[PDB]
């Protein structure tokens, strides 16, 4: 199944923090803070100039490693995107973001997408009143994601739900913090998040 194990090695290697843990990857020490250099014996050594391929490679993984999914599931979406209308590329992020488990991270019901997933998988999450246990669900506008009844309580939700009081959730997002529910509003334009990534290259990569 998914990637499991050493994560903080990945806020690094890619050479850029990508907030993959809970509070740690947000706390003074995200595998990069202390050691902002690539993993393994050859860490504190001077890099040689990457290949153009290498450059494109690292950029893709980064993005995937951010959303944290199989190369299987990942590329389908690219080709799907690659097939569609006009920009037929940048739209990609929209398809990535429509993932249930992705959304739940943004909706602050959890902090790691990894934590998000275990919820959806354990089916602590519902959509439009439906017990939905599938982290791949491409959600759409006006769909509603809320905690189920057997789990409205649960220590893990409350604090995770609470700490959200502070920030303006995504333009495409909305949250009844007390009501434990959110609405997918719209398709996040490229504007709506300057990811640390240059998606232009992922395209360039996948056209091998």
């Amino acid at each position: 199944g998914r990637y499991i194990g050493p994560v903080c090695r990945l806020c690094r290697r890619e050479g850029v923090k990508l907030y993959l843990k809970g509070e740690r990857c947000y706390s003074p020490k995200c595998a990069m803070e202390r050691r902002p250099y690539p993993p393994g014996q050859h860490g504190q050594k001077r890099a040689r100039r990457p290949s153009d391929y290498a450059v494109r490679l690292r950029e893709k993984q980064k993005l995937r490693r951010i959303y944290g999914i199989s190369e299987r599931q990942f590329r389908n979406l690219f080709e799907e995107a690659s097939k569609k209308k006009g920009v037929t590329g940048s739209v990609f992020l929209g398809l990535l973001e429509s993932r249930l488990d992705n959304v739940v991270y943004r909706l602050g019901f959890a902090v790691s997408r990894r934590q998000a997933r275990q919820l959806v998988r354990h089916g602590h999450i519902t959509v439009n009143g439906r017990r939905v246990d599938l982290p791949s669900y491409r959600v759409r506008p006006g769909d509603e994601i809320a905690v189920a009844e057997k789990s409205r309580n649960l220590e893990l939700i409350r604090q995770n739900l609470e700490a959200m009081k502070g920030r303006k959730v995504g333009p495409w997002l909305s949250l009844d913090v007390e009501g434990m529910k959110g609405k997918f509003l719209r398709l996040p334009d490229r504007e709506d998040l300057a990811l640390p990534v240059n998606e232009q290259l992922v395209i360039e990569f996948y056209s091998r």
Binding site: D52, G86, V87, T88, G89, S90, Q200, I203, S207
Partner: protein
């Protein structure tokens, strides 16, 4: 200001009585990503001086690159020696579909959406020198009527 970029370094070697002496060659692109690109070729006893004088030589053969939002006004194909480059426009959200030599130019002239092929001798040097000559022969619907007139 400008945006340098080498796409080629190489080590030639003449020969002398006892041993072979060397020289290094460097091909640098220099752009603005706004429609201005240049290209010169550096040859010097050691590496960086060439690279340096490449970028010197580069900022000469500059070129109006009359974009039409991240693309070219029309399709062009040019032949340099026995090397051949095909330039084809593209609707936005396409990509810069090119080898490593020409994409290391079209980007620095702007161009976010273009289709390309190399044909004949894929030698980078003579390929580079070609592509420039393609841009230099780009003409705009504006550029044309200036000619298809009277007096």
């Amino acid at each position: 200001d400008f945006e340098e970029k080498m796409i080629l370094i190489r080590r030639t070697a003449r020969m002398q009585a006892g041993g072979r002496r060397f020289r290094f060659g460097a091909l640098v692109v220099v752009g603005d990503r706004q429609g201005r690109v240049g290209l010169g070729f550096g040859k010097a006893p050691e590496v960086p001086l060439a690279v340096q004088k490449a970028g010197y030589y580069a900022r000469r053969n500059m070129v109006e690159v009359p974009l039409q939002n991240g693309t070219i006004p029309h399709e062009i194909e040019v032949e340099f020696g026995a090397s051949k480059i095909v330039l084809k426009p593209a609707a936005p959200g396409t990509g810069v579909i090119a080898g490593a030599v020409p994409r290391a130019i079209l980007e620095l002239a702007g161009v976010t959406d273009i289709l390309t092929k190399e044909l004949g001798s894929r030698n980078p040097i003579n390929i580079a020198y070609a592509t420039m000559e393609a841009l230099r022969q780009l003409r705009t619907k504006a550029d044309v009527e200036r000619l298809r007139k009277g007096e």
